[PDB]
Design a protein around this nucleic acid. Structure first.
Ligand SMILES: Nc1ncnc2c1ncn2[C@@H]1O[C@H](COP(=O)(O)OP(=O)(O)OP(=O)(O)O)[C@@H](O)[C@H]1O
Ligand SMILES: [Ca+2]
Length: 425
DNA sequence: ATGATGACGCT
DNA sequence: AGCGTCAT
């Protein structure tokens, strides 16, 4: 009772750019704005692979991973923008640079953890404290939360429902209690409105966001009202929210562990986990996983927002599917050179921008036949940012994996070069 | 014939 | 070190 921690110590947000690559291409090309459109990678095989889809095109059933030729069957008017191709591979530089635009704005408000090219977590606890002292027990106006949903409220127009729930929420806040977790989340949402307004003003890009007490709840919250909206998930909203929430929706439970929770326990929803002891969960899923599940199904998680705005590794990969699999030594060598040249370009920019140098090169390949991501990984020293040296070193490291040949057997269906172990410079 | 990339866990 | 998992 009085000694059971409730996981309400922090205010955490997750910001997620809406259909990010589409927004980048729509900013650049106004003819794509407010249209069903998608971004496509490559072109020859079935019109290319769709990597991002505007919300107008999603209404027709267009999805990521679909072939553009197939997407045109669902949406004949679909407009397409093509990812840049350099040295025979997709080049995502435009989107990485757009991501930096957004991340740099977010960093003005708080310490961020880059979670992907277009997501970042925000630890707002200190900014909320400061903003709560600048307020003098002043009530928070609904005008300060013009795109916020309060999950679980109210308890026949979309915006009308949003305001009704927001009104119910604001009407019961303990405004004079500076330590009230619900009040802290509400101020957190005010700051996130300001952060999202600044992103849109300064880049043209819209995003969604979740505000809660931890990263898992903030990420879940973000997806509840997309696009261009933000959602506050309070501690008290967790029992009803989790009571019908498929386990797979919780971050890290979308794969084999989540499937085993469902199968071993015979449950479907996150809230059903509360009926097991911590020891029971640890017995089925291990000490770390069981302790994490025991707390998480109660809305409690302690994973910190890591102060990290830059990636820890810089990598370049390309798949070679079906008949395009690399089957000669000259082929393997040329593509390792192509990847190494793009990697050198990124590394040199990274050293100038971010005052660091990578010291290890990881080479990963996939062999025709294995359903895994990688068949083999080996490392070597990375001492000079030179594409010819890196590709020669990568070959030497993987040369012995060749059965016999001028020929390369079995053929390679993936090449991957990753620079790691950065040191300041 | 998805594809590109990145974090972190386990041993 | 090298492999497996999970994610955008
Ligand atoms: N299966 C995948 N393969 C490759 N890249 C992916 C994949 N899923 C996500 N990504 C990368 O993450 C970026 C953001 O993906 P996300 O799932 O957030 O979709 P989105 O296009 O931003 O739409 P939403 O509005 O739903 O967020 C994508 O542009 C892509 O670069
Ligand atoms: Ca996104």
């Amino acid at each position: 009772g009085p000694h059971m921690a409730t996981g309400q110590d922090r205010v955490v947000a997750l910001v997620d750019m809406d259909c990010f690559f589409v927004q980048v291409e729509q900013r650049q090309n106004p003819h794509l704005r407010n249209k069903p459109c998608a971004v496509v990678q490559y072109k020859s095989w079935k019109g290319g692979g769709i990597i991002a889809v505007s919300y107008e095109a999603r209404a027709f059933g267009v999805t990521r991973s679909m072939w553009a030729d197939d997407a045109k069957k669902l949406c004949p008017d679909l407009l397409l923008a093509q990812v840049r191709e350099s040295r025979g591979k997709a080049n995502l530089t435009k989107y990485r640079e757009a991501s930096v635009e957004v991340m740099e704005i977010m960093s003005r408000f708080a310490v961020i953890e880059r979670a992907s090219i277009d997501e970042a977590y925000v630890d707002l606890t200190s900014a909320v404290q400061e903003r709560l002292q600048k307020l003098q027990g002043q009530p928070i106006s609904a005008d300060l939360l013009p795109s916020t949903y309060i999950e679980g409220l109210p308890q026949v127009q979309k915006e009308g429902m949003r305001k009704q729930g927001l009104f119910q929420w604001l009407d019961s806040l303990q405004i004079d209690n500076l330590t009230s977790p619900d009040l802290q989340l509400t101020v957190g949402a005010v700051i996130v409105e300001e952060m999202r307004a600044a992103i849109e003003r300064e880049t043209g890009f819209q995003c969604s966001a979740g505000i809660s007490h931890n990263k898992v709840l903030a990420k879940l919250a973000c997806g509840l009202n997309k696009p261009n909206r933000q959602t506050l998930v309070s501690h008290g909203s967790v029992p009803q929210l989790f009571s019908q929430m498929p386990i797979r929706k919780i971050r890290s439970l979308g794969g084999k562990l989540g499937a085993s929770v469902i199968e071993i326990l015979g449950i479907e929803y996150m809230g059903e986990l509360t009926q097991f002891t911590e020891s029971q969960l640890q017995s089925h899923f291990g000490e770390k996983n069981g302790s994490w599940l025991y707390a998480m199904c109660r809305g409690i998680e302690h994973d910190p927002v890591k102060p990290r705005q830059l990636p820890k590794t810089i990598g370049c990969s390309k798949n070679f599917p079906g008949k395009t699999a690399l089957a000669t030594r000259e082929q393997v060598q040329w593509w390792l050179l192509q990847l190494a040249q793009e990697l050198e370009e990124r590394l040199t920019k990274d050293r100038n921008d971010n005052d660091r140098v990578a010291t290890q090169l990881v080479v990963s390949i996939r062999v025709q036949g294995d359903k895994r991501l990688s068949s083999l990984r080996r490392c070597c020293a990375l001492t000079r940012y030179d594409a010819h040296k890196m590709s020669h070193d990568a070959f030497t490291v993987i040369k012995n994996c060749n059965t016999s040949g001028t020929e390369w057997s079995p053929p390679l269906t993936m090449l991957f070069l990753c620079a790691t172990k950065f040191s300041a410079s």
